[PDB]
Amino acid sequence: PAIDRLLQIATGFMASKVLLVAASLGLFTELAAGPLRGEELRARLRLHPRSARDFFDTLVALGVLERTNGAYANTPATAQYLVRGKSAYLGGLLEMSDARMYELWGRLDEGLRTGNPQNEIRTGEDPDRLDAFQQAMTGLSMRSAHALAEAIDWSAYRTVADIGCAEGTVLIHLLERHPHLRGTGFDLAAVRPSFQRRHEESGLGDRLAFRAGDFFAEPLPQADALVFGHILSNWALPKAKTLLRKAHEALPEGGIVVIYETLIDDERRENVPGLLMSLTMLLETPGGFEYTGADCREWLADAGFRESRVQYLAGPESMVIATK
Amino acid sequence: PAIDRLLQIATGFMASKVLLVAASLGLFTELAAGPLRGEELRARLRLHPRSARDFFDTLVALGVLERTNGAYANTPATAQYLVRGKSAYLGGLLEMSDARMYELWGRLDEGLRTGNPQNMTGLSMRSAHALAEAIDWSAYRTVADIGCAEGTVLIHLLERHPHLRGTGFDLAAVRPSFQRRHEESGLGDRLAFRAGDFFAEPLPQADALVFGHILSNWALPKAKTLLRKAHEALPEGGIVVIYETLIDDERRENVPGLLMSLTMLLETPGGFEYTGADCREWLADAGFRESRVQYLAGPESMVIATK
Ligand SMILES: [Cl-]
């Protein structure tokens, strides 16, 4: 029945917390080398004997652990993605959800009533957990980057600029996939060291450059293609529109702007991740918001772009592409 | 792939809170009289204009609201089960989850590290109805519900089977709530309340003793003591009826039961969820002649034993 599905979604915070805490404990990393009996896994995690077995068995019933003759083991997915120290490790997303986002969403009611963010802005304010979270975000960025490299005919362009490039994961992957491209990452000066470390590791050399700048205070770098990944959604609409104006001014005739986000579907009735992201923007920012491709096409029209289209990218991400 | 499903479970707290807040706001009750435009719904719920439309459309995308021409309406399921003031209302679970359980589960890690705890009528109805249908109550004349609370389950049993005489047993402080339901039922002298502490005195004698979500609240030695006392209270051929959100015997499949065991960790000093096989062992040690486990109502199962 529909009511049963509704109640299951409504009480999903419990199964969520089980996985989140297992990630914070590094449970799957403890099992990386091989299976462990419950008592040994309990001892290594410093858990109390009252509920350790219940906890491990809940993970089994959720399908994220195996158990064979009393020995717990990783599933394929947890061995691949939830073991610390592997390049594919995504558990940092769960560690930060456990440490911060679960309680932030506990303030949804106050966010909805006040329209105000409920995070550190409301309060006026672990390095290894930050690093793990950044690794997971770099992994998600990589999925978008792999899709972006195939979703656009990059042979039509010689130069690309990523606006708000952070450590430069997307730009680096684009350049590695398309050796004819030259790239410029644009971000605040504080981002330079993290970007340049990835630049060094990539071996791209002079094909990649970093430009320090504040995109709300200075012009954008000229390039054939400008990329805005999860940029416009952080700001109220008038600020987003100034960026589209700057993008139009930085591009040549025939150049493109590529905007990607966890877009809501145009009818605002299908895309759960995009709509949940709009509530995340409520909780995290003073004026940020998630939008639809149709919304963005309107803004791009106002900014003078000749044409535009909406295109699926990968996972929860989609993009709007416009031509000057 | 499996990692995508895993991530969806892990981030399930978000869609959960959307539904929990909708229940706490009484949103579905506001739509009970008919569809409302978003501005009208926002105004009636006193939500800020920044994110009200986002919130309403999240409910639409989750499949719990309908929307056309900018007007929001209940789905059949929320119209039937999430409107307050109706006997069918199941939203109490969501209101209590929003007010208490979401934050309590926020302390799951401290519960796991320490072993220490970290801390509505419609919810018992499905099990109450099934209990009256799943047992041949014609074989018995008297029944006692041990830990009867406000008496919902026992009252329904007596209404369904007019030949039965019933005793609700609970702490003295429960009597006012029980009396209210007792008066409303019209059962009269066929139903009685008996005040007592089942860890301090014998249980009421009856042909059948019912333990609905009782044993799981207490440490195993105390649960075993209650089963001993049940055996002492019953006649030859009498039955003990236990029902719980049991974990499966192999402890690898029943997510509701396993989650309930973690809820018992967070809420009680000694409670735990258990399996049917567990309970049958306890029942044998307490002297019961035979026992069986049966599915009762969805995630609820019952264990029955004969003296
Ligand atoms: Cl063991």
Cβ neighbour number for residue A65 with a 10 Å cutoff? 23
Question: Are B234 and B242 within 8 A, CB to CB?
Answer: no
User: Closest Cα of chain A to B102: distance in Å?
Assistant: 7
* Residue where a domain terminates, one of B105, B139, B167: B105
Distance, CA of A212 to CA of A28 (rounded, Å)? 39
Q: Which residues contact A83 (CB under 8 A, 6 or more apart)?
A: A28, A29, A32, A74, A89, A91
Nearest alpha carbon to residue B4 among A309, A267, A273, A39: A273
- Would you call B11 and A97 a contact, using CB atoms and an 8 Å cutoff? yes
Q: Which residues contact B106 (CB under 8 A, 6 or more apart)?
A: A17, A102, A103, A106
Residue A130 inside a domain? The answer is no
Q: Which residue in this structure is represented by tokens 């309107």?
A: A298
* CA-derived radius of gyration, chain A: 22
Torsion over CA: B48, B52, B54, B55 (sign): positive
Distance, CA of A197 to CA of B197 (rounded, Å)? 68
Number of H helices, E strands in chain B: 15, 10
Known binder of ligand: residue B198?
Answer: yes
User: Looking at the complex, does the CB of residue B115 fall below 8 Å from at least one CB of chain A?
Assistant: yes
Q: Which residues of A touch B99 (CB under 8 A)?
A: none
Distance, CA of A226 to CA of A324 (rounded, Å)? 11
Q: Which residues pair with B165 in a beta bridge?
A: B142
| B290-297: strand order across its sheet | B191-195, B165-170, B142-146, B208-212, B239-244, B300-306, B290-297
Residue B196: give the domain boundaries. Answer: 121-306
Three-class DSSP category at B242: strand
Nearest alpha carbon to residue A281 among A273, A272, A290: A290
Q: Which residues of B touch A46 (CB under 8 A)?
A: 113
B248 Cα to the center of ligand 1, angstroms: 19
Distance, CA of B57 to CA of B49 (rounded, Å)? 13
Resolution of the solved structure (Å): 1.7
The answer on B244 and B100 residing in a single domain is: no
Distance, CA of A223 to CA of A161 (rounded, Å)? 6
Distance, CA of A141 to CA of A321 (rounded, Å)? 18
Question: Are B280 and B127 within 8 A, CB to CB?
Answer: no
The answer on B290 and B155 residing in a single domain is: yes
Helix (H) or strand (E) holding B169: strand B165-170
Q: Which residues of B touch A55 (CB under 8 A)?
A: 112, 262
Cβ neighbour number for residue B10 with a 10 Å cutoff? 25
- Would you call B19 and A1 a contact, using CB atoms and an 8 Å cutoff? no
List, comma-separated, the residues after which chain B is broken, a break being a C to N distance over 2.5 A; otherwise answer none.
119
Structure tokens at A242: 């100034």
The answer on B290 and B185 residing in a single domain is: yes
Q: Which residues of B156-194 are buried (b: 16+ CB within 10 A; e: fewer)?
A: bbbeeeeebbbbbbbeeebbeebeebbeebebeeebbbb
Residue B135 inside a domain? The answer is yes
Nearest alpha carbon to residue B15 among A5, A134, A115, A295: A5
Question: Are A17 and B105 within 8 A, CB to CB?
Answer: yes
Structure tokens at B269: 């000093």
How would DSSP label each residue in B11-39?
Answer: TTHHHHHHHHHHHHTTHHHHTTTS-EEHH
Distances in whole angstroms, Cα of residue B281 to Cα of each of A21, A285, B224, B287, B288: 33, 56, 10, 10, 10
Residue B217 inside a domain? The answer is yes
Three-class DSSP category at B198: coil
Torsion over CA: A187, A191, A194, A197 (sign): positive
User: Looking at the complex, does the CB of residue A136 fall below 8 Å from at least one CB of chain B?
Assistant: no
- Would you call A13 and B11 a contact, using CB atoms and an 8 Å cutoff? no
CATH number at residue A289: 3.40.50.150
The answer on B287 and B186 residing in a single domain is: yes
The answer on B130 and B98 residing in a single domain is: no
Chain B residue closest in CA terms to A286: B50
Which residues in chain A (73-112) have CB-CB distances under 8 A to chain B? 75-78, 80-82, 90, 93-94, 97-98, 101-103, 105-106, 108-109, 111-112
Distance, CA of A289 to CA of A241 (rounded, Å)? 13
Structural domains of chain B, count: 2
Q: Which residues pair with B170 in a beta bridge?
A: B195
Known binder of ligand: residue B170?
Answer: yes
Nearest alpha carbon to residue A108 among A225, A282, A237: A282
Experimental technique: X-ray
CB pairs under 8 A between A and B: 228
Known binder of ligand: residue B4?
Answer: no
Torsion over CA: B14, B16, B22, B25 (sign): negative
